[PDB]
């Protein structure tokens, strides 16, 4: 099945109105290092909740 | 859980004998035929045992009048009066459904002496 009329840019935007992305609300700060990270995720340096869980 | 456990354990018989599949057992059941109430005996080989506590059951197969009859008794049902193990059998399965296609010398079960 195919369209009988060409949809409009108005309808295209109305459909795409729900396609907007959502940014991260906030970033946690590690106590020991102080780096920003996602909550419940280890930092880039390898620290989680004040403990060096991994090396690098 | 605990509530249902108590409700079921307050209804379980404490005089149930220990039997295994392949054992010949006789079960006395209350006919309650008409006004009178009498006991009828059903003797046969146990082929299946379901041990679910109060919901426990056992299946007995008997060749009666040339016809095979399988009867499933609820262990703790008041209609069952007495279970007596007439003979012990030696099998290696919990279920003996292969006996449904055997008759005569092929349906014999070796006795468990020890």
């Amino acid at each position: 099945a195919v369209q009988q009329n060409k949809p409009t840019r108005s309808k295209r935007g109305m459909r795409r109105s729900h396609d907007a992305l959502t940014a991260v609300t906030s970033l946690s700060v590690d106590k020991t290092s102080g780096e920003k990270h996602l909550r419940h995720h280890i930092t880039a340096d390898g620290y989680y909740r004040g403990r060096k869980v991994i090396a690098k | 859980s605990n509530i249902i456990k108590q409700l079921e354990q307050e209804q379980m018989k404490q005089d149930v004998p220990s039997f295994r599949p392949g054992d010949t057992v006789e079960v006395k059941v209350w006919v309650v035929e008409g006004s009178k109430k009498r006991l009828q005996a059903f003797e046969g080989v146990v082929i299946a045992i379901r041990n679910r506590g109060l919901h426990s059951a056992f299946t007995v197969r008997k060749i009666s009048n040339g016809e095979g009859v399988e009867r499933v008794f609820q262990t703790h049902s008041p209609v069952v009066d007495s279970i007596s193990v007439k003979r012990r059998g030696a099998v290696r399965k919990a279920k003996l459904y292969y006996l449904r296609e055997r008759t005569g010398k092929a349906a014999r079960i070796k006795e468990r002496l020890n």
């Binding site: - | 309650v32 703790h76 049902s77 008041p78």
Partner: protein, 209 residues
């Protein structure tokens, strides 16, 4: 009249002296505490609001905590309402036990049925499946036709299709009251009631009995 709110514990069996096995459902009906009584003047109708169970203090919100404090009762897991018949009166803070069904013979049980999710037409509306063989092509559990060539040239409202099945309010009426154990706060009724184990049930006196 009014009913009670309990929790579904499970199903079991009761053996009677004549050998009959009755499949019963265990319903844990503890004390229901009255939190608010409504009248024809302030509210326009007569009903009582009740609560049951317990709830965590750290999760009871401040408005709910204030409502329960005004009621004078401890916080429960929810709030329900029961219409008051003529000549029936209750006070705020009153505790109602499972003894209310001591003389009740038949009850109606309302619950939330187990959710089946998105279900097809065959499961949801008992539609007949088409032929599995004899040339059938990719149309086995499909609904089939849903209208007419023209007049109306559309699909009627209420057409039986696929969609959400279960997870809805279901009432089963006229269930025999097998037992009322006041000591254990238990109500044993014959048959099955909607919902799974741990769901909240509402048990009322039968209306059609």
């Amino acid at each position: 009249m009014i009913g009670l709110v309990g929790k579904k514990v499970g199903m079991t069996r009761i053996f009677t002296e004549d050998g009959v096995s009755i499949p019963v459902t265990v319903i844990e009906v503890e004390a229901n505490r009255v939190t608010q009584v409504k009248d024809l003047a302030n509210d326009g109708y007569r009903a009582i609001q009740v609560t049951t169970g317990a709830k965590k203090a750290n999760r009871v919100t401040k408005p709910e905590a204030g409502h329960f404090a005004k009621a004078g009762v401890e916080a429960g897991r929810g709030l329900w309402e029961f219409r008051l018949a003529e000549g029936e009166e209750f006070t705020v803070g009153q505790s109602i036990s499972v003894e209310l069904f001591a003389d009740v013979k038949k009850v109606d049980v309302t619950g939330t049925s187990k959710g089946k999710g998105f279900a097809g037409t065959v499961k949801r509306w008992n539609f007949r499946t088409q032929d599995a063989t004899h040339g059938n092509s990719l149309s086995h559990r499909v609904p089939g036709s849903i209208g007419q060539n023209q007049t109306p040239g559309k699909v009627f409202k209420g057409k039986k299709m696929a969609g959400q099945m279960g997870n809805e309010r279901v009432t089963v009426q006229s269930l025999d009251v097998v037992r009322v154990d006041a000591e254990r706060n238990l109500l044993l009724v014959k048959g099955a009631v909607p919902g799974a184990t741990g769901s909240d049930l509402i048990v009322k006196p039968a209306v059609k009995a």
